[model samples]
Target: RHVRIKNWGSGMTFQDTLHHKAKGILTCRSKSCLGSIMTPKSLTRGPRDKPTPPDELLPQAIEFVNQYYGSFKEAKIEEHLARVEAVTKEIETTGTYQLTGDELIFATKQAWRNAPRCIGRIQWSNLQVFDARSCSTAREMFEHICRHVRYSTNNGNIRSAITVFPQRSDGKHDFRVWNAQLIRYAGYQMPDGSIRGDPANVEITQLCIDLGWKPKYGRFDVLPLVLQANGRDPELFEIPPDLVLEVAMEHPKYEWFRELELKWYALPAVANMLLEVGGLEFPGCPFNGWYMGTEIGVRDFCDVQRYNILEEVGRRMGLETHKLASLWKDQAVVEINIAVLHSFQKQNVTIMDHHSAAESFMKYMQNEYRSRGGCPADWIWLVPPMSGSITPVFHQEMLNYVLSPFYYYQVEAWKTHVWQD
Candidate 1:
């Protein structure tokens, strides 16, 4: 039996698409299509309420491997497909599917390729996946995370990576890492009612307080690791502070900049997102990529709801901000962005600028579309946050969607908070 998707792609999220892809159902949502088990989607998401099948993702996964790995490696499509079929069938009956190491590596890379909004897909196949599916204790989880950070930091070279814990399954516990990221600055709401550090982290900062960890109100204080291992009480563990690295902000010309004392963690490890492979989901997957200059300069440090540094920087630059059209704010942002790039380069930490990142994505798009049948993109996301028009990616349009074997947002891992007095 076959159901058809007439306009599913119109407003479907990446998760919705996973529902149909993982289930292996052929719904005719294409502007034109056949009712074959492998039907193509056109600018659509997927059916959420529908029962997802086990082997439904085999078609796309097979095609993906063939495209990327066939030329350089021996890719036995028949064998891989049979394996997928078996897994799907078994999972259908048993409600669980396990991925082999090599297969997981391939899936990890392919997921990057399927990420419609990421600019870093150019390095999709080079990702180093840490498989910790066997470990469930909070101490075990902490050990893996520490290893991941130390290895990826690489003494400032900064390698992109992910450390995956258990999958979401029945008779299975959902794991949660309460920290927003592996490395985030603590925000203290001072008695004077002024925020002393990254305001974005205020809630989690307070959580640390509730958990009985006394944090000094410092601008660059790193948060300790908090994880709920295998559905137990949320556990708090701290890594060696030196093992976590940070870069102090300075400028090429301004010496006064050093006096202001701003710094950001060298690694921006996203601690709480789901890494979905085939039909399974890993909720406590912490991953990191080298920072883009503007992510810190424009959003983290400068957004009105964030650090709101425009006025201070403008004052330092001796620019009058009384007029909104003076473009002083824009000029200040440019300075901060440049300083971020300059500081990272000085520290020998791997980082990317908006212009270079945009150029790379443009090249990535051209190559991906040729190798694969189509490339999905969210133009608004691909474009740089600052100086949107100058970058090449801003002008081009892409039909946005996620191909399967992807990572996405999930609810927090911890349900109840346990604190020690």
Candidate 2:
């Protein structure tokens, strides 16, 4: 039997599953798939997935203390040793230790720098860290999150920032954010077997609905924040519309592109990544960086499992849509990228095209190699989704390894959580 596209409707997850199975390479062979993989799982990857044995906590904390002080060119041995002693005593008494404000700032930057999958690591040092460790209620968490969104959005000239929430203490009191991103569209499965919004968010959208979130049933309705504090039931908070900056899509050459009535939120705040610093695990740290143009144009717009707009755009462009040899997909995708970049530029929003983004990443890699012997990079993620060969990052070999003070994906809060009695 000849192979063909396996899924059509509600296929984003299916396509990604197939992508991983194919080893994410067009020419991947059986040998290449033998022992190699893209993402790696380690203790560092899911620090809070299971409870850390009481005996191992001290060792992990001490190792983190050494890493902090060892990073300085001129070691502050006296201050470092004093902090370590204080941390040891604190953990001995309460089984957990809090990071000093200075240490928190240092650890935040290190996590971003150590992230291998992010292409914007060059700006890692410029992050604004908001320490919300004192937040005790879901309402307070909502306020801190709103402040983070407003500060980072900055009226569309997006700035990089992260808001660190309370750390996971005793496995039972882990604070969590249920939404994958701070701002994402709600997906509503229709009675006609069609979806009105982002299909990727169908599950979360339904969860939000069940949790009493009013559904707008629009293509781009921003989902409410579903936050759980102190392991209590999650609460929903609506983000103020004024705080979200959106850019309207338009093309310079194609007047009809505006009639497509497409728009996208400007800020890309990742809301579900776990932040590990030293031995402390933070389950509710939301972070953001500006978007790369192709992220919107190629993947979000043209992906067969996403908006699946390639055929529509190709037909509108007067291309031979029925013929694959016409390269209509490629032609329409390029135009979409141009439109995305142009729209962001027209709105004075901060966005970078993939060409410049790839080049900047190459420079970051070079700096990494010079400062430290090697940089941890995931080749599959480092390469831009489209025009891979045209980018400098594609021609280079890379290594992927886990580094502590890293941000990692974790199991969804709703999946593994038990509401406190």
Candidate 3:
């Protein structure tokens, strides 16, 4: 179906014409499309509202089991066959089988390793997996999430982590988290028809308000979590503020930059992505990794649909803000990105510059090909938002494909939910 997205931002009558697919994925097919800048590079896959039928599910489970065993060098062939046999029997009986604790760990790590969009895949093996599959209640989910936040935050030395919730049984009673990030500033529409705070979160922020979360009406108020346990009516939980570590943005050379009052959460935990491993789908796995400077500095702050601070920053730099040919945007971006790097370093937070990260990923990509003969990568995503030509990944041709034990994008829980009051 075709959907026209109007007022995607102010004064620009550039309505985004999107083609909505069967899985509820949106792809722009219009001349006015602003390219990757306006769209996230994530490719959503599979059915979000139903468990895969056994006919399709069985082979997938067997393939993942084989892949898991194949990674082991010294392990016995007898043991591998036995493990695969056991998985088949369990699936025959229960329609879906559980991954052993070790398998679960391997699955999460490999999912990170297989993700084409993530430049931080070099740190894939370093992730700490919290198996929260035993959780049953909304309150329990909240507690598990809180623990994931604290551990991943690690007092600003951010660590890669994922807390896997229970697998979807019928999909109707699926567990899910609604927030895009574990911590994001709320965006509220003002009476004057302008938006306050991060405009990216306006829909979720409005949903939070509707669910009885009192808005503080501040630029950096961290939004409360909307969690649905067993597909019940979603419940709201405000994250304890003390657990959130924030870096206040300030430039090393510019004293006036402090007046912008821009601050961002330390941990870049994506709370809503689905984890698919061995035919089982976990709709509520919150994963974290340290941020790349451009993620916050360029996309978060400068995107027209996001905070849109580029013009203000250009004006602040006393550049010819009115002229596009003056390259004010380019200069302002470097300073803002500098401020991001400086602020995170000053606060002792874990953050990587795009150059270093791109270089590291090149090494990781080489290692993957040497070991497995292929590396999954998306060039549009692998290239840094700024200085694309300067990054080594830009020159490299790469392939992108969906691999099992992968982190896939799911439709918002609200979009597929059968609401019950």
Model 1: CA > 4 A from native: 1-78, 414-421
- How far in Å is the alpha carbon of 110 misplaced in model 1? 1.2
lDDT of 2 by residue, 23-84 (tens): 13223356664224433344223434456665578887887788889889999999899988
Candidate 3's TM-score: 0.89
Global CA lDDT of candidate 1, please? 0.73
Clashing pairs in 3: none
Instruction: Using lDDT, give the best candidate's number.
Output: 3
Error of 2 at 421 (Å): 8.4
**Candidate 1 lDDT over residue span 1-421, tens digit each:** 2222221223311112222333333344668644332224432222132333445545443454443345345777776667656665766676456777877777777777787778877787778899988986999999899999999999999998988788765413667687879988888889898887888888788778777778899877887787887666676788788888889899998888887788888898888766766566677788888999989999898999888888899999999789978899999999999899999999989899988898887667667654644556667677788999888776675555555666676543332333332
- Pairwise TM-score winner, candidates 1 and 2: 2
Ranking by TM-score: 3, 2, 1
Ordering by lDDT: 3, 2, 1
lDDT against true structure, model 3: 0.84
Can you write out model 3's per-residue Cα lDDT over 1-421, one digit (the tens) per residue? 2222222212222111111101223344565632355234446643445666876788889988898988987877997899889988988877888898999999999889888788989998998999999999999999998999999899989898899999888777888899998898999999998999999889899999999999889988899999999989989998899999999999999999999999999999898888988778898899989999999999999999989999888878899998899899999999999999999999999999999999898788767765765666677788899988787777766655557787888777677667798
